[PDB]
User: Fold Indoleamine 2,3-dioxygenase 1 from Homo sapiens.
Amino acid sequence: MISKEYHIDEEVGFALPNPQENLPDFYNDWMFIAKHLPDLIESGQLRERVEKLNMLSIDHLTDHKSQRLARLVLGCITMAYVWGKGHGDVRKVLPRNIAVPYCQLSKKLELPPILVYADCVLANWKKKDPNKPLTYENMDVLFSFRDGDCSKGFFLVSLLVEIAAASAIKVIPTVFKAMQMQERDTLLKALLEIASCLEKALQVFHQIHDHVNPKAFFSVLRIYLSGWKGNPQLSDGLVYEGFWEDPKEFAGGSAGQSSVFQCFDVLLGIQQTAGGGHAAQFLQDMRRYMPPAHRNFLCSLESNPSVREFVLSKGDAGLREAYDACVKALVSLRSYHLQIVTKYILIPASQQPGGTDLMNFLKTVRSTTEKSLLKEG
Amino acid sequence: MISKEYHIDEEVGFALPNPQENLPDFYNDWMFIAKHLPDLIESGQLRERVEKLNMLSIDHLTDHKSQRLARLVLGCITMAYVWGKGHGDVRKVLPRNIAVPYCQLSKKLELPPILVYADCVLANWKKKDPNKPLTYENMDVLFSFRDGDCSKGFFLVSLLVEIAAASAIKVIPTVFKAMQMQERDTLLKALLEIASCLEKALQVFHQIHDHVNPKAFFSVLRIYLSGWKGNPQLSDGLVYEGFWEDPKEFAGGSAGQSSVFQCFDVLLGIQQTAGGGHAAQFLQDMRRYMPPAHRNFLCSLESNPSVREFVLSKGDAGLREAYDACVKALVSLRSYHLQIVTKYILIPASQQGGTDLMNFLKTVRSTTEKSLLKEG
Ligand SMILES: CCCNC(=O)C1(c2ccc(NC(=O)c3cccc(Cl)c3)cc2)CCC1
Ligand SMILES: CCCNC(=O)C1(c2ccc(NC(=O)c3cccc(Cl)c3)cc2)CCC1
Assistant:
């Protein structure tokens, strides 16, 4: 069993178990705006409604789940405020009434004041029926940006992959214990179980096609998830009015912020974040957009003995094959993500008057992964 | 006591205790070049002597101290080779004979193939007399670049600050044990002891003025410690011939690579690595330039519950005061480092940069000053 200091759930992994849906009544003015972003954006009243808020104190957010919900609420409001209708009419100053409590709450949780994956996927969900299991039909998201944005599909399928990967995460202690104890058969079994779980995560990933259409994702949802780091539309970043003097740059929400997007690479010694230029640096930087317990889990994995060096040394075909099943499962996931980038970004981008950087990043990550196979796939 | 897996010595902290001076006879050709850099650089013989080397296997470097000495040797040779006489005539390719074993050894130790703080400060020292204490008068460096470079003063004063901070490092287990056991008075005493040890480290820092000349530092030593990451002189990085096909960028040696430069910020919950600014980015990136045991120690500190959170939760003026004493000691250290950069970089740069380092340190100082609790 993994230690409770890492905030990894047995069932849902890095996802926030049973997220809070309602804030205390003190924050009803926040909740109305966040729950009606589609309507307020279309009516041209979103920015007016945000600007007419009073500066609410964060002190009535007493527990972690209420603080995580408030982050999700404030993050969604912030994206809507900055991006507006999503056609270039932007705002480069986040008003103090929202910016101050958002930044205070963000400092408390050690997350940047921008909507991250941990907000819009890991905390942005509920069970419809609490007695029925974690399947797509028994689940919903808490917040969307626009009507027809496919945020439900995009977020929930991401979450279901995250939950599928939780079955692999719980085997990680067995791997390190087996290595410490020199329990070859136990280690072999653990690696095969991880491979099996990552294969199941890929099958869960296939559900994306049923719940997201390309036009909607590319032209709508991708706009609202965009950040203000190296972005021509907010060249200097965003001014958080009354908290920081200078504008601050933060990257937008993405799958690179998922802890499972790199924890198995780290486990297996696939040196994604080691001296491999841009891709490495990006994966390292995205740790600062994860909850602090989850980033600490990643560096804690790095402090343990190398799984790769254990397998490489042992002259054991069964063990090398079990390691390779895990590495191949990761290759297959990268390949599927590359297919998704083609369908949902490249093709829609070509049909205009695309996401080539993301394609090249995934090709580099896949190449590093494939090259860590002990035998060719 | 701190666990042995973190490679923290009770006396010298993150410094390598009693570093090795001589390699095996197999590496005499490396040792000769490293021991004669002042003469070989000045005469224009360094680069040809490196280029004439046979590619030596790293497999005869049997222990950790031998591998660390070899890193120090190869690191110093590499800086000398890249920068030459330090007048801007640069080498863009490091030849395979040196590059391959340096990159191999670097991969084995999990450090980048460039001279880091852990090489040129933490492993680059000896006592003159083993029976006498760790003082400047009883100490020497193992390698320098040029005659008059003030490498002794710059490296050893950095080391002596590092050693002074070791007295605070050994209190860290007492801090976390006292929090776990709910031992208020033990925690208060531990925080006051850390503040005192950091105050003492500041007084040790004052010796820099006695042993380093601004002109010599700026015009010579700073040049040899420079890396090839965002450096216009090697815009694409350095080619490590026969290891990687494409050139690779790595940052140069600096105090930002010292584990004490951030472990007390981490201990006290001063979120230096949080957010997406330059300072947060830099401090996190510099953990990859620390020895793996030391980066693991920093990770372990962050995995433990927050000292800041504990002190703030208690409504205890005595405990807040002892916490603030540590924060104040850090502010003073940052302020002192700023004064050094003004004297040793900014003023010499004005008399034929430094501004990026100053802004980094001002951000770090401001973040530290904002962490003061005062009332509660
Ligand atoms: C803000 C949500 C971003 N969501 C995505 O961008 C999508 C996605 C989801 C999940 C992943 N995850 C992996 O590829 C992976 C890699 C390694 C190991 C594991 Cl377990 C998983 C990638 C993209 C959903 C459609 C594209
Ligand atoms: C390659 C050596 C680089 N050496 C320096 O650049 C100098 C130096 C030394 C030490 C420090 N250390 C701190 O400022 C500090 C901060 C927080 C906690 C502690 Cl214990 C210490 C900074 C610069 C020496 C003259 C400038």
In short: Chain A touches chain B through 23 residues (CB under 8 Å).
